[PDB]
Amino acid sequence: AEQRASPLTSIISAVVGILLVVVLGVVFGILIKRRQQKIRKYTMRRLLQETELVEPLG
Amino acid sequence: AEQRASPLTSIISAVVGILLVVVLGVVFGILIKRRQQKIRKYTMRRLLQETELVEPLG
Helix, strand or coil: CCCCCCCHHHHHHHHHHHHHHHHHHHHHHHHHHHHCCEEEEEEEHHHHHHHHHHCCCC | CCCCCHHHHHHHHHHHHHHHHHHHHHHHHHHHHHHHHCCCCHHHHHHCCCCHHHHHCC
């Protein structure tokens, strides 16, 4: 019938969904671990890029 | 003549790729803005003087 019934398309949509949730889950946990009694001062490291705002070319 | 030649499959793979990169971008931006509003803002204010170390004269 007209009913699609695409198996692959169904898997691709399912895979991605979990993929996005996985990638993040890893990033979130990573930050926490590096946060739990771990001062990396990442703020300053990223702040060095702020100078670009007050560092024109001419 | 061609191996696959699947237009949809090509779009699904392209969409996801950008999708994952998009979601993250939003998460990263949020955190930053969530840190800039930290009670330790004073740190940054004083950090602006650090540039003097990497700001030599002609």
